[PDB]
């Protein structure tokens, strides 16, 4: 390795740095939370009462187990275009709260649901934050929300005094004062009704088709995790270089005993450098202390290459008795 770092067949007498050594992990343990309930995704997607886009409905998910396999593998009608997470990698993570929003969108307006975009419905009907995360789902509803002469019960606004904030609902029945007519409910000319009907048509092709859109708005906040997935819980190993998956907070290290005094509302723990140093066991409510495994530098002490061919490796940074860590044990 001394000849491999600096490119020469002959290496002169001195001390050089070749590489670093680090003990590899040996075991994996997963400890999620204690729950059973199954999440009711068959009541949001398989619903019958989708409202108008200008006034949607806001749902909540509580402590249950959500199987994300049925989301994409079963019933794969249209493309997903998930903005910030992978559907295949969705099973490992688990979150704090899940919100589901549902409304009906025109066929050409499917692409309007995007971070920061603008449009006829992207400003006055539904606005997304720029840092939005989570998948978006859209599919055809040509048989469900459609009438021969057209349905007039689905409304979208056109006029407002200002654009909407992200995740802001602004249902209101009023006339718009435009021009020089001081309308006091008279609703004359240039005093227009801001809510204009859809006017469906089943004989038309793509462009005015009934598409049903549901979105999911995840978040990753340091809190008691509530919804978690189907991975099985395992045992716990003390004083061994292993891998851990405590509540989705992955990493490698050594789990030991702790003497900290956590308050009942305290879960995580950070050091000065803003890095996790103490994690409460979710299924035991005990305190631990995460410490990374041993590491250090390696140096080679040799005389001149043409003089002799014997070396002396200096293992740095580590106590040679407690962690002796192949020239080892010679």
């Amino acid at each position: 390795e001394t000849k491999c770092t600096l490119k020469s067949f002959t290496v002169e007498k001195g001390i050089y740095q070749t590489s670093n050594f680090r003990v590899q992990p040996t075991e994996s343990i997963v400890r999620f939370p204690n729950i059973t309930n199954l999440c009711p995704f068959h009541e949001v997607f398989n619903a019958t009462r989708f409202a108008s886009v200008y006034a949607w409905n806001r749902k909540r998910i509580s402590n249950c187990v959500a199987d994300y396999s049925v989301l994409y593998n079963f019933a794969p009608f249209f493309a997903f275009k998930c903005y910030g997470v992978s559907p295949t990698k969705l099973n490992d993570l688990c979150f704090t709260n899940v919100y589901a929003d549902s409304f009906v969108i025109r066929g050409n307006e499917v692409s309007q649901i995007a971070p920061g975009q603008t449009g006829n419905i992207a400003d006055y009907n539904y606005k997304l934050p720029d840092d939005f995360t989570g998948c978006v789902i859209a599919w055809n509803s040509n048989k469900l929300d459609s009438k021969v002469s057209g349905n007039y019960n689905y409304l979208y606004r056109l006029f407002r005094k200002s654009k909407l904030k992200p995740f802001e609902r602004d249902i209101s029945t009023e006339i718009y004062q435009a021009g020089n007519k001081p309308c006091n409910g008279v609703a004359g000319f240039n005093c227009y009704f801001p809510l204009q009907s859809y006017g469906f048509r089943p004989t038309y092709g793509v462009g005015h088709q009934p598409y049903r859109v549901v979105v999911l708005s995840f978040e990753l906040l340091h809190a008691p995790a509530t919804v978690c997935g189907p991975k099985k819980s395992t045992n716990l190993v003390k004083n061994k270089c292993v891998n851990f998956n405590f509540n989705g907070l992955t990493g490698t290290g050594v789990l030991t005993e702790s003497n900290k005094k956590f308050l009942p509302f305290q879960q995580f723990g950070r050091d000065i450098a803003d890095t996790t140093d103490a994690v409460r066991d979710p299924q035991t409510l005990e305190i631990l202390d995460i410490t990374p495994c041993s590491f250090g530098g390696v140096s080679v002490i040799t005389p001149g290459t043409n003089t002799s061919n014997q070396v002396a490796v200096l293992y740095q940074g580590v106590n040679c008795t407690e962690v002796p860590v192949r020239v080892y044990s010679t």
Partner: antibody
Framework: QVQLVQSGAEVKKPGASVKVSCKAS????????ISWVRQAPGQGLEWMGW????????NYAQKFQGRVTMTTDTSTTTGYMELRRLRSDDTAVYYC????????????????????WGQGTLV | EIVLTQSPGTLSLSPGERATLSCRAS???????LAWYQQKPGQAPRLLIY???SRATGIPDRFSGSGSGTDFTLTISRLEPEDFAVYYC????????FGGGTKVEIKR
């Protein structure tokens, strides 16, 4: 793979209280409500009760208000009827079914229905 | 309340040819409220189609349904003789009601 068992068949005097059981297995008893229906010879099927699982919402029919009360226990995964004020013309078979029509969490209307049935209890 | 008009009362038809079942409601209903159940003698109900024509379990070559807005009908081809069940159609939008009656007889 679904198993739905109930109590046996017996005869009750009118005006008494009949204890009806419905034990479920093969599916998680957390996201599907129970529905109690009645079949008698000579006509079709009635619709006494719908009962949620995650909470204790009641959706008893208008014809059985104040008479039918329903309980469910997740410890044994079993539902119980304590149906009192019995009559002489209501001796018929009763089926408990895993329902898919109403919301088991929030209560909205769905698409689907009674996909799992028991064998029934004759009174 | 809402009821449904039931007059496919008699089906004295041979096995094999076209079969169509018609049941109609009192009031206009949505297209997502449709269900149908079969009654073997001394047995238990189970689904045929949970929606308009969306399959539930198997449906080899016979069971079909088609909903024309408010009304809805049943399309069966190659009627094999063994089933001969009692047919029930159910709405979902307002409360819940069940089918009236439909029989197939052996034409002795």
């Amino acid at each position: 793979q679904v198993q739905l068992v109930q109590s046996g068949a017996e005869v009750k005097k009118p005006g008494a209280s009949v204890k009806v059981s419905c034990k479920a297995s093969g599916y998680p008893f957390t996201s599907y409500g129970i529905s109690w229906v009645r079949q008698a010879p000579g006509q079709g099927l009635e619709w006494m009760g719908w009962i949620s699982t995650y909470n204790g919402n009641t959706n008893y029919a208008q014809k059985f208000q104040g008479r039918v009360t329903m309980t469910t226990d997740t410890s044994t995964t079993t539902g119980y009827m304590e149906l009192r004020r019995l009559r002489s013309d209501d001796t018929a078979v009763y089926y408990c079914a895993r329902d898919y029509t109403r919301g088991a969490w929030f209560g909205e209307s769905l698409i689907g229905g009674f996909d799992n049935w028991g064998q029934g209890t004759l009174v | 309340e809402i009821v449904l008009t039931q007059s496919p009362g008699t089906l004295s038809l041979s096995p094999g040819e076209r079969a169509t079942l018609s049941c109609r409601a009192s009031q206009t209903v949505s297209s997502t409220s449709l269900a149908w159940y079969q009654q073997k003698p001394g047995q238990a109900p189970r689904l045929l189609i949970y929606g308009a024509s969306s399959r539930a379990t198997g449906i080899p070559d016979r069971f079909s349904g088609s909903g024309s807005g408010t009304d809805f009908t049943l399309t069966i081809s190659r009627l094999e003789p063994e089933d001969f069940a009692v047919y029930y159609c159910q709405q979902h939008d307002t409360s819940l009601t069940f089918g009236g009656g439909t029989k197939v007889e052996i034409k002795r």
